[PDB]
Amino acid sequence: SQDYLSDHLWRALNA
């Protein structure tokens, strides 16, 4: 889930 976390987080901050 770390990959996911890194994923959705990046986008959640950018968008």
Side-chain angles (χ1 to χ4, degrees), residues 1-13:
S1 305
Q2 69 77 29
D3 188 270
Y4 177 85
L5 209 297
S6 307
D7 188 66
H8 75 150
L9 177 283
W10 97 256
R11 207 153 55 241
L13 82 91

